[PDB]
């Protein structure tokens, strides 16, 4: 973001900014956190089934928007509802954002 | 404090085009002596790193068991994959009279009086898994009272 | 000569990682100052060094200003523009002046200014790169021991200071000893010691645990609070989000090895490690360790907690000179009152009797009905006056008319409390004798009388500190009123 | 010393080990300088006071 | 006199009197001895009782206010 983006090798400087942006999305908003989370709000139980199995290895209460094809056993606070329509996801994301704003008093 | 306890090391192998490579597996167990106990398997290419990696997962694997005064609650079975451990509480049985790999897991759990004997293939890692599920389903009268009858007294007199 | 300037600029730029421009600006200022000292008159001087040759021209600078205060160093914009129309306010007019010969005098001045520029560039960038160290446990060598402070050498011409209050009470350092401490403040005393290092504050304990406990450095375990009596005893409160990790066991380590390493670095300070709880009562029970707590009563309004202990545990709960209760109170943020179970019951009986007497006296109710109000949790006339009508209607035997009458009586009792004080010395004597004190409105007189300051003599006896909590009274206004009261009472 | 090159740091020349020293005169008499003569062997650069 | 160079805390004053003197930047016994009784009575949190304590303590060391 400032400094060695030119200093030694221009092609290899394009390697690092090719390294950067793939790491930018995979490790997105996790770098601001540090340490383990306290809860975990999932929007699809079936698709992200690794994390629910991963979070239940530790002591993390999770929050899954579940569709009818998945299995609601590892999730603690199960939420039934559609999750493949875009307008459906903005309900749950808009609710979980505005409520946690009220919770950060 | 944690009172760690080793049971058995082993020399396992696997082969490649160059030859065969050994390693070591070492089943251990840890336990507080007052109702917490946990085992962990662990395996590595050298016995100091094998037993240390065994304990490090045994710390996270601890389970709570509810007992009375150094002995069990009731008789309880223990079946797991060719290892039928029997456990009888034996109120002041004057020592833990059990076989190998049960004498470890019962001691660090904190009991001192149980009579026990393993029926079947006396294999060490499969028999310490046999006592654990046999101990974690064994229930105190408190849990029995608060699901059934709803008096702590009359359920055992 | 010429190529030597370039070789010096390149050597210094590479060795001190400093912009060549900043070194030249400083050499120009150094040479200007050395030139000014050769003239008997106070002149203004600009020096310009050529960046390719190392040659330098010296001027009689004339700071272009709007109004000339110093005719020897300043020129008006109108006069400057007569020589060069391109000049603006803040520019310099020059005058062909003989450049000072670079003798060992100018050489020494140039060396001093370069060293000072390196302190504000190389050393400043080193401190910026060591952002962790500025906050973590820096290591220094004791250069000098004075009565009131210890000077540490950190290397690279950086000096730090440990103040006497920042040392442990039993530490004795000698010149040449290595000392660790937290860099808790960076000020601007470049010449001398700008760095302030502590060994006594709680941050030293936190950072020692961060280094000794990997799980704290990895943010798996968090230190929520630390309370410390330096060189004697500390308490730390630890939390983890990972249910597989015991945070107390991790900080203690195998057979206490980790906590003993921290204790040894702190001169044998005893460290208690407690589990942080989000419930204040459970957290205080944990903080009181090693004393067993029998019961806790929480007063949320006073931000206080009464802690009952068994009579055998009382001495352990208080600790030597109150050290255990004080460290628990500092760790929780609550005021902690440690008493026996029998003393807590006697206190509650005395409070219940005082509440019954207050309600019987002011509400014109019988003792039986006053007892019911106290058993339902009412202790003050304010609670009865202001609590939601629904809570008073939940009490067995209260109807809506009786609750309204009880609230009206409680409000009238509260009013009469202030009204009697006013009639005696509030809207009467405090609004006359104490009103004489410069700046004493009727509202302030009633606020003073609510603290028991009813007369002009009572106000003359106060300190500024006794009045500091009165809403609308600044320390200056309090001081003025106390002095006005003293002038009338003691010097009238 | 390496510091004998401090001169070089602002100027240059060779080394500073050479004893820098200005021929200063002794005491015992006051006075008022009334007349100064300067004689120059021919070829030598006349300075500004000559 | 080496007594003037001592801090005011060495006078064994009440915690109130010492904190009132520190609030007025009086650090040494030599600073205290120069102040008049009328000046000390203007200081914040300085009562007639604390002034009598300061006089009695200064008198025990052979010092007086206003030197």
UniProtKB/Swiss-Prot annotation, chain A:
GO terms for biological process: cytoplasmic translation; ribosomal small subunit assembly. Keywords: Ribonucleoprotein, Ribosomal protein. GO terms for molecular function: structural constituent of ribosome; zinc ion binding. Signal peptide: none annotated. GO terms for cellular component: cytoplasm; cytosolic small ribosomal subunit. The keyword Ribosomal protein applies. Belongs to the universal ribosomal protein uS2 family. Part of the 30S ribosomal subunit, contacts bS1. Some nascent polypeptide chains are able to cross-link to this protein in situ. In collided ribosomes contacts ribosome rescue factor SmrB. Required for ribosomal protein bS1 (rpsA) to bind to the 30S subunit. This is Small ribosomal subunit protein uS2. It comes from Escherichia coli (strain K12). The lineage of its organism: Bacteria, Pseudomonadati, Pseudomonadota, Gammaproteobacteria, Enterobacterales.
Curated annotation (Swiss-Prot), chain B:
GO terms for molecular function: rRNA binding; structural constituent of ribosome. Pfam families: Ribosomal_S5 (PF00333), Ribosomal_S5_C (PF03719). Changing residue 103 to G: In strain: NEA-314; neamycin resistant. GO terms for cellular component: cytoplasm; cytosol; cytosolic small ribosomal subunit. The keyword rRNA-binding applies. One of its GO terms (biological process) is cytoplasmic translation. Residues 2-65 form the S5 DRBM domain. Keywords: Acetylation, Antibiotic resistance, Ribonucleoprotein, Ribosomal protein, RNA-binding, rRNA-binding. Altered uS5 proteins have been identified in a number of mutants. Some mutations in uS5 have been shown to increase translational error frequencies. Part of the 30S ribosomal subunit. Contacts proteins uS4 and uS8. With proteins uS4 and uS5 encircles the mRNA as it enters the ribosome, which may play a role in mRNA helicase processivity. Can be cross-linked to mRNA. In collided ribosomes contacts ribosome rescue factor SmrB. The N-terminal domain interacts with the head of the 30S subunit; the C-terminal domain interacts with the body and contacts protein uS4. The interaction surface between uS4 and uS5 is involved in control of translational fidelity. Belongs to the universal ribosomal protein uS5 family. NCBIfam families: rpsE_bact. This is Small ribosomal subunit protein uS5.
Curated annotation (Swiss-Prot), chain D:
Coiled coil: none annotated. Co-administration of salinamide and rifampicin or salinamide and myxopyronin suppresses the emergence of resistance to both antibiotics. Acetylated on several lysine residues in the presence of glucose. It comes from the Bacteria. DNA-dependent RNA polymerase (RNAP) catalyzes the transcription of DNA into RNA using the four ribonucleoside triphosphates as substrates. Belongs to the RNA polymerase beta chain family. The RNAP catalytic core consists of 2 alpha, 1 beta, 1 beta' and 1 omega subunit. When a sigma factor is associated with the core the holoenzyme is formed, which can initiate transcription. The rRNA transcription and antitermination complex (rrnTAC) consists of RNAP, NusA, NusB, NusE (rpsJ), NusG, SubB, ribosomal protein S4, DNA and precursor rRNA; S4 is more flexible than other subunits. In pull-down experiments interacts with CedA. This is DNA-directed RNA polymerase subunit beta. It comes from Escherichia coli (strain K12). The lineage of its organism: Bacteria, Pseudomonadati, Pseudomonadota, Gammaproteobacteria, Enterobacterales. The chain holds residues 896 to 945 of 1342 of the full protein.
Swiss-Prot record, chain E:
Coiled coil: none annotated. Residues 1-67 are annotated as: Alpha C-terminal domain (alpha-CTD). Belongs to the RNA polymerase alpha chain family. The chain holds residues 250 to 316 of 329 of the full protein. The modification ADP-ribosylarginine is found at residue 16. Acetylated on Lys-48 and Lys-49 in the presence of glucose. PatZ controls acetylation of Lys-49 but not of Lys-48. This is DNA-directed RNA polymerase subunit alpha. The modification N6-acetyllysine is found at residues 48-49. DNA-dependent RNA polymerase (RNAP) catalyzes the transcription of DNA into RNA using the four ribonucleoside triphosphates as substrates. This subunit plays an important role in subunit assembly since its dimerization is the first step in the sequential assembly of subunits to form the holoenzyme. Part of the processive rRNA transcription and antitermination complex (rrnTAC). The complex forms an RNA-chaperone ring around the RNA exit tunnel of RNAP. It supports rapid transcription and antitermination of rRNA operons, cotranscriptional rRNA folding, and annealing of distal rRNA regions to allow correct ribosome biogenesis. The N-terminal domain is essential for RNAP assembly and basal transcription, whereas the C-terminal domain is involved in interaction with transcriptional regulators (such as CRP) and with upstream promoter elements. The gene is rpoA.
């Amino acid at each position: 973001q400032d400094g060695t983006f030119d200093k030694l090798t221009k092609k290899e400087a394009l390697m690092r900014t090719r390294e950067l942006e793939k790491l930018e999305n995979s490790l997105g908003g996790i770098k601001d956190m540090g340490g383990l989370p306290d809860a975990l709000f999932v929007i699809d139980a079936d698709h992200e089934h690794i994390a629910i199995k991963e979070a239940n290895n530790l002591g993390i209460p999770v929050f899954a928007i579940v569709d009818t094809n998945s299995d609601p056993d590892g999730v603690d606070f199960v939420i039934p509802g559609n999750d493949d329509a875009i307008r459906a996801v903005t309900l749950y994301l808009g609710a979980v954002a505005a409520t946690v704003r009220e919770g950060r008093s | 404090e944690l009172q760690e306890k080793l049971i058995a090391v082993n020399r396992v192998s696997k082969t490649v085009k160059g030859g065969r490579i050994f390693s070591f597996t070492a089943l251990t167990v840890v336990g507080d002596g007052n109702g917490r106990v946990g085992f962990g398997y662990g395996k590595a290419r050298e016995v100091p790193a094998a037993i240390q990696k065994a304990m490090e997962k045994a710390r996270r694997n601890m389970i709570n068991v509810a007992l009375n005064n150094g002995t069990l609650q009731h008789p309880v079975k223990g079946v797991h994959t060719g290892s039928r451990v029997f456990m009888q509480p034996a109120s002041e049985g004057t020592g833990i009279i059990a076989g190998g790999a049960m004498r470890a897991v019962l001691e660090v759990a904190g009991v001192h009086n149980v009579l026990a004997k393993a029926y079947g293939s006396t294999n060490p890692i499969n028999v310490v898994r046999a006592t654990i599920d046999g101990l974690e389903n064994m229930n105190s009268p408190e849990m029995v009272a608060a699901k059934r009858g709803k008096s702590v007294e009359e359920i055992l007199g | 000569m010429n190529k030597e300037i370039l070789a010096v600029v390149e050597a210094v730029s590479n060795e001190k990682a400093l912009p060549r421009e900043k070194i030249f600006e400083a050499l120009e200022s150094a040479l200007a100052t050395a030139t000014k000292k050769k003239y008997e008159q106070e002149i203004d001087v600009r020096v310009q060094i050529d960046r390719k040759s190392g040659d330098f021209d010296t001027f009689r600078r004339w700071l272009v200003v709007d109004e000339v205060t110093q005719p020897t160093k300043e020129i008006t914009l109108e006069a400057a523009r007569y020589e060069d129309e391109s000049l603006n306010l803040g520019d310099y007019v020059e005058d062909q002046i003989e450049s000072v010969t670079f003798d060992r005098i100018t050489t020494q001045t140039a060396k001093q200014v370069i060293v000072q520029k390196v302190r504000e560039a190389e050393r400043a960038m080193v401190v910026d790169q060591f952002r962790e160290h500025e906050g973590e446990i820096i290591t220094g060598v004791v250069k000098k021991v004075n009565r009131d402070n210890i000077s540490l050498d950190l290397g690279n011409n950086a000096e730090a200071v440990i103040l006497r209050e920042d040392m442990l009470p039993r530490e004795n350092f000698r010149p040449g000893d290595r000392v660790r401490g937290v860099l808790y403040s960076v000020r601007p005393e470049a010449r001398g010691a700008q760095l302030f290092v502590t060994r006594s504050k709680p941050e030293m304990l936190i950072e020692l645990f961060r280094i000794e406990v990997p799980e704290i450095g990895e943010e798996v375990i968090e230190i929520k609070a630390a309370a410390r009596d330096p060189g004697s005893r500390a308490k730390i409160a630890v939390k983890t989000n990972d249910k597989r990790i015991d945070p107390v066991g991790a900080c203690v380590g195998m057979r206490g090895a980790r906590v003993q390493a921290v204790s040894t670095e702190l001169g044998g300070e005893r460290i208690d490690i407690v589990l942080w709880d989000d419930n204040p009562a459970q957290f205080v029970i944990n903080a009181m360790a090693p004393a067993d707590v029998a019961s806790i009563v929480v007063d949320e309004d006073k931000h206080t907690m009464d802690i009952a202990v068994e009579a055998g545990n009382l001495a352990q709960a208080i600790g030597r000179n109150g050290q255990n209760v004080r460290l628990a109170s500092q760790l929780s943020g609550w005021e902690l009152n440690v008493m026996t179970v029998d003393d807590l019951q006697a206190k509650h009986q005395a409070e219940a009797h005082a509440a019954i007497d207050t309600f019987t006296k002011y509400l014109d109710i019988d003792e039986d009905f006053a007892t019911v109000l106290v058993e339902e949790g009412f202790s003050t006339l304010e609670e009865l006056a202001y609590v939601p009508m629904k809570e008073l209607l939940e009490i067995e035997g209260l109807d809506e008319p009786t609750v309204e009458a009880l609230r009206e009586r409680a409000k009238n009792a509260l009013a009469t409390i202030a009204q009697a004080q006013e009639e005696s010395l509030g809207d009467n004597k405090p609004a006359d004798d104490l009103l004489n004190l410069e700046g004493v409105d009727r509202d302030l007189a009633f606020k003073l009388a609510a603290r028991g300051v009813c007369t002009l003599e009572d106000l003359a006896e106060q300190g500024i500190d006794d009045l500091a909590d009165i809403e609308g009274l600044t320390d200056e206004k309090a001081g003025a009123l106390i002095m006005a009261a003293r002038n009338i009472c003691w010097f009238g | 010393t390496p510091e004998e090159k401090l001169l070089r740091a602002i100027f240059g020349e060779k080394a500073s080990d050479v004893k820098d020293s200005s021929l200063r005169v002794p005491n015992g008499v006051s006075g008022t300088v009334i007349d100064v003569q300067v004689f120059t062997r021919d070829g030598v650069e006349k300075d500004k006071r000559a | 006199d080496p007594i003037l160079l001592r801090p005011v805390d060495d006078l064994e004053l009440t915690v109130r009197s010492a904190n009132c003197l520190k609030a007025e930047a009086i650090h040494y016994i030599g600073d205290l001895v120069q102040r008049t009784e009328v000046e000390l009575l203007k200081t914040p949190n300085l009562g007639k009782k604390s002034l009598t304590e300061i006089k009695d303590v200064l008198a025990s060391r052979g010092l007086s206010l206003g030197m």
